[PDB]
Swiss-Prot record, chain D:
Homotrimer. Self-assembles to form a layer. Interacts with OPG158 (via N-terminus); this interaction is necessary for OPG125 association with membranes. Scaffold protein which forms a transitory spherical honeycomb lattice providing curvature and rigidity to the convex membrane of crescent and immature virions (IV). This association occurs concomitantly with viral membrane formation. Targeted by the drug rifampicin, which prevents the formation of this lattice, and hence virus morphogenesis. In the presence of rifampicin, irregularly shaped membranes that lack the honeycomb layer accumulate around areas of electron-dense viroplasm. Induction: Expressed in the early phase of the viral replicative cycle. Changing N28D: Confers 80% resistance to rifampicin. This is Scaffold protein OPG125. Coiled coil: none annotated. Signal peptide: none annotated. The gene is OPG125. It comes from Vaccinia virus (strain Western Reserve). Displays structure similarities to capsid proteins.
Amino acid sequence: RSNVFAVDSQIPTLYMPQYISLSGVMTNDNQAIASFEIRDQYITALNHLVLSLELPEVKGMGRFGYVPYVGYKCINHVSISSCNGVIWEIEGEELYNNCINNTIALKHSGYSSELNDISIGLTPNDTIKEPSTVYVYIKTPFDVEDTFSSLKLSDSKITVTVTFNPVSDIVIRDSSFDFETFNKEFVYVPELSFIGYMVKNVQIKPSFIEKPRRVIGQINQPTATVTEVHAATSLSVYTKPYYGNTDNKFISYPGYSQDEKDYIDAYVSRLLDDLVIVSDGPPTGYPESAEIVEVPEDGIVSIQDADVYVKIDNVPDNMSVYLHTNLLMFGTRKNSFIYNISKKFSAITGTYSDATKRTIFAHISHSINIIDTSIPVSLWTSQRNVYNGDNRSAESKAKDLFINDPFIKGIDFKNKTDIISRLEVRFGNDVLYSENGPISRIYNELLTKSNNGTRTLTFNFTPKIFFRPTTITANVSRGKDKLSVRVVYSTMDVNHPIYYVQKQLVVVCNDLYKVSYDQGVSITKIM
Amino acid sequence: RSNVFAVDSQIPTLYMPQYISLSGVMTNDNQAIASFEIRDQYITALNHLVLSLELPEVKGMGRFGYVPYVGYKCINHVSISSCNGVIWEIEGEELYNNCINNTIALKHSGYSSELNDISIGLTPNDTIKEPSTVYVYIKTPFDVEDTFSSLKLSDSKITVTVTFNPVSDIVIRDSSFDFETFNKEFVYVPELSFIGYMVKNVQIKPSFIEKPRRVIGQINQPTATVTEVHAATSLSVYTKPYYGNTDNKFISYPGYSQDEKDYIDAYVSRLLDDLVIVSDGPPTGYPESAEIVEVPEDGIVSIQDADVYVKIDNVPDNMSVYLHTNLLMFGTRKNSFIYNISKKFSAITGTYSDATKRTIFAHISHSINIIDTSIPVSLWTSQRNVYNGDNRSAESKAKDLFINDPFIKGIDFKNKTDIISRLEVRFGNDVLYSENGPISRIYNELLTKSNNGTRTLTFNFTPKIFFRPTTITANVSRGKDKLSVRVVYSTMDVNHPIYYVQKQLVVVCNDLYKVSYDQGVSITKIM
Amino acid sequence: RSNVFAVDSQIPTLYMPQYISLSGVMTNDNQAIASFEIRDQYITALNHLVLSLELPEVKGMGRFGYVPYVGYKCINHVSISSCNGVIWEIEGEELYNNCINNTIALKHSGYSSELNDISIGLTPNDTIKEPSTVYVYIKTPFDVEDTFSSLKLSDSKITVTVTFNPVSDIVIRDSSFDFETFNKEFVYVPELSFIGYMVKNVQIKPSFIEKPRRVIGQINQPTATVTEVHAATSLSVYTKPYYGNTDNKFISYPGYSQDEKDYIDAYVSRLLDDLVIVSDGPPTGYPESAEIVEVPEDGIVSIQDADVYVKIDNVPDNMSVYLHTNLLMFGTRKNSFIYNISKKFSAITGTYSDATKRTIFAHISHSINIIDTSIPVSLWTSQRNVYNGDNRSAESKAKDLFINDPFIKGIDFKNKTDIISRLEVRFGNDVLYSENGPISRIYNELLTKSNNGTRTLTFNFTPKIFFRPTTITANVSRGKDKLSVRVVYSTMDVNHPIYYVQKQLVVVCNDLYKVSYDQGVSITKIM
Amino acid sequence: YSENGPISRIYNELLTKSNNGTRTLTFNFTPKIFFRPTTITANVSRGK
């Protein structure tokens, strides 16, 4: 019988860990680059890299806030090199995707009301935001099995290089803020930390590492190809929107609250102030194409099949209630279907306030959705629209927000709508996999215990470090050495504005490399 | 010294995985049965079964919604067989209990506002719900240790059989919905997926598997017995309510919000509209036994020791405020204690709205609880009640909801009240365990890291796959081969309606089986 | 090739577990001590200790509630001994810190609205709280590796001793409650449970255990020293506030809601009733130093550079709106800076209610923070304050609350502000580590997956039970046998009241011990 | 086999010299009567 009530305690290698901190050299649209040099013959191994960033004080007038997870979204590229060349590198988006399921890292990276609330400044000497510091955990393959997986520095020099995104990407602002001055006087201040191990009489053996590789397809094309595939462990596919042909302005943004319900409530709250107006006589200051009608005594206004129920309490006797019946409208033919935001409301109740001269709304019933909240403003007024699209007031038009978040997926802010209806993967010339529904995404989320998975084919099911990984292997004789992907996009109604948002296909492939430790660190591609 | 900075990488067996999808055959109260046939000599092993289901479009008038986790609650039975007979089977409730701690699986199975909100239809051509698809992860013993635990198909035919519950169980509806037509036209559409492994020169060895077995006791009896117990790893006990002697109608249901506070708020909100009435003269349309009194100037109404504080703002000068002092009442003797829902309120404030002709309530102080929210409507008006129980208006009575959820535990919707005060377990003739408090439930939750544990005795503490499991073993000579359970139910007040809800005892025992792989797959009970 | 599709099932040692429960002996400011005796020659091992506590019924008048996690916060000290002396002991605070990341244990220990809401009693026979029971999971080193790590009772007697805190520490109450009677009649009722293992022909081997050791520094001194350090695995540092020179009264407490936003909202809600007053003529009943001014027609009141915007609807025609412009004020010089809570508000809106004769506030904009919510009341009126600090009404002063929570860290209730700006650790005479930012706290939280880490140096990275732990080792020849810590506290503004809160430094060191099993259990310090 | 456009119909019409072909997969290209026809053959072991 095997003893399950006692073990023989082994004596491990003698070692001692130490926390080490390093400052870097900054060089320069003058993109910023930081280089860190690690040189000590007693540092045998290292892992758990952490980058710190100091954000400065912001003063002035206007409305201003930071995007969520600013620390992660400010990183463009990370590279680790030695004298024999690059050992490992990754783009920022792949790091974000790999760390998306680590709530503690996300919270440390910068997620709070003080940072993400949309603050207001009244005078040129008002302080909008106080200074603070964020920390970005750079997860690497060397962390998966603590000491067993650490990187051994066989008496070589290691260089870490971090490239930063321009500061315009991480800021949410309105047109009143003095962005040119802010951008001229903003500077990045970084610092790198890691855990080192001092080892006595180490015995080194070769090991194995995986390197991700990204390919971006052409605009609106439904194909992409990865060449020189000799040993891959997985393949991932997703899409990105391209907003380069707009001015990047949006009607609303919820800030710290990030639920779907919060997005919808913020949008509806921004529209309600202009949708129902209490005025003495016909309201002035609107474009000529506005159709503002008076609410009857029974409270029901008909807008061609749609009925809106409006009841306001405490209305002064010298005033009346009016309804804006075409706040935003879009159509491609003069007598075809019309997308009209006014017809998405069914009941509106509230009470007028004499002290503040505005209406305080109570219960609202509506059918607004995330696509409506995600339509960009500039598409409402494009040349293909035969109507005047934006019938809002100037005060409302002055509150639009610039949003330049670089890691948006799908065609909406939450990646909720699935726009891929069929996927087909070919390895060489033969079909390797085809599916209609998102069963591969379901399987990815189940196996990785994540809420934000993507369509992924996984080929390796063996434990990571103690076994050689299982791969799909090339056959250059028959020509099986490339993976081509083809999708069919869903069909949308030609009268919905979201139909004209352009998109790009993204394919990610994980290649296998061999690590040898004679003459320092070097890698060789497995063939 | 043992090296903790390097390992020897072993070469694993050569294999290649593949995702496989299969369609099934449907046969037929004409209970639906699906059969799936797996036949390929190169599929050596499989695991991670996933079932997909397509839910259709629902049109018409009335109020309609789906129960939470509809995908799990639609499954009655799953069986896996070969030519030598059954290999593994389980009922739906045991699967649900085993998967209750997997948040990602639960969310995939169907949990969202679009599915679980109580929608309203106005015309016979209104679309209440759009079509969608859910996925049910069928967790099996073959998943616990990836490749090591997979099921080996030694050149045999494998059949999977799924039995479905009738559609009436998964729908929450009011009496206005045309359920007979919906039930006549509804059809199940299923599809099975799994991960297969193509292995080269496999070397097979025998292994071990555990099979659950459920016993259901007689109505209201506090005993149950499991026969033929020769090697069991655990024992579980819980209770179920039986609502078969009612019409299954309830006053309220919160829908997507599933907190205790949400249940209580929905119930209170449904009662408040009928509890306090603002009217010009005595309200009409109520049964003769109603006692509706006028609120005095100081705002305090006395109902025999209980005092209710009522203050309403903006009351028109031609109207008064009335209070319904016996909305729901129950008692067994003419002059004994009375359970009166009106006496559970202490303060009610709000403001009357002239535009909508209703009262908008603000702050409420009350002592309603989950048992009150869980009492079925038909028990308020049973024959043993000497009063007229339901003094609500017809409009309120028309809003009751049918609820037929099949996996309810305890006597309330959240299984919060503990109605078992003492438990005694006998193995053979001798007492094996006895307890007063729920220390076994505490231990179960601690050891399995679950929030919804049950009273469970665990006999196996060894690692699952690499060791033979530890069991309790029979001694047929002394006659130790059966487990009998006896409980004592808590004592409730004879004047509470919940006292008359019937219940059933459920016992679950996990038996051990041996798996051999010569002549395909076969099992033999360990004796 | 190694087989990854099959294993050889080993046969384990024959054993059988059993749940055992014991009652204890109580002895006696007459601090309570419980002793439990374990004596059975067939109990070979044990782990998973659980303590249960019965809380009694509380009746009377006033406001009363329990602190969160009362079960954990009621424990002062736990000790485990045999005939050879103490085997393991720990203070309550170290246990709480070790278990802080176990949500299920925390929830079982007593965390609910019924326990933690601030209830109100109206008559001397009112029932404020019903009786209930809590359970405290006493996590020990013997649990980390189930059967492998269990404690072997080599035919010796084991004694467990639990010391309890006085009941005044676990209760939150106002001055109206009859605490002297409650404290005279309260009694502790405990019971211990554990899992025992009956083993046949056990084969015992020696093992390894770690014992924590706490040192508390002197008041306001920034140094502390641990002597006799021969083999330590880690070192931790944090600070505690000392409230012994006050009366322990606070303005508000949120109860069950424990977010920062909840603290701030409760504080603001308590202040708003006294900050803005609607009255017929100048309000009476305030001290002579109050400066109450009338709000002009434009609604803007200036308080030296600060502007407050006040708009109240539905004000009766015989009444006016007044603003209290110096509710709480503190300063050290007659014409220097003043901390004035009235200047932290920028906009206040609401509606007066005629029925209840009070103002119902709607939207509030403010800059109150957690330090303001955490300032104790007695510091507002200290002798060093040259103004009259507390200008509230007597009714408001009668609602203050006593709070005596014993496990508060930092200087605020959430330990959010970091008051340590530099840390330096010396081992012997030489500097072992120094840092400016909290990178060690970041690393602690990352490595232990916790949200509430402390500044910790970790020296052991090897797996716990199967390897001998790595330690830092003394060199008595050079005199390296002591660890001295020195901090520099942050600098605060001399006109903020929080500057005068006293603090204490706490250092925790984990020493290594050897366990041998000949002649029962005994330990010997590794040298 | 999988296809998007009607290339199989084009091939059917080309090979049979017809104006009204359908989507057809042809497996036999040998002369009809003097040779045994070429077929696609089952593999009941793998279940094809």
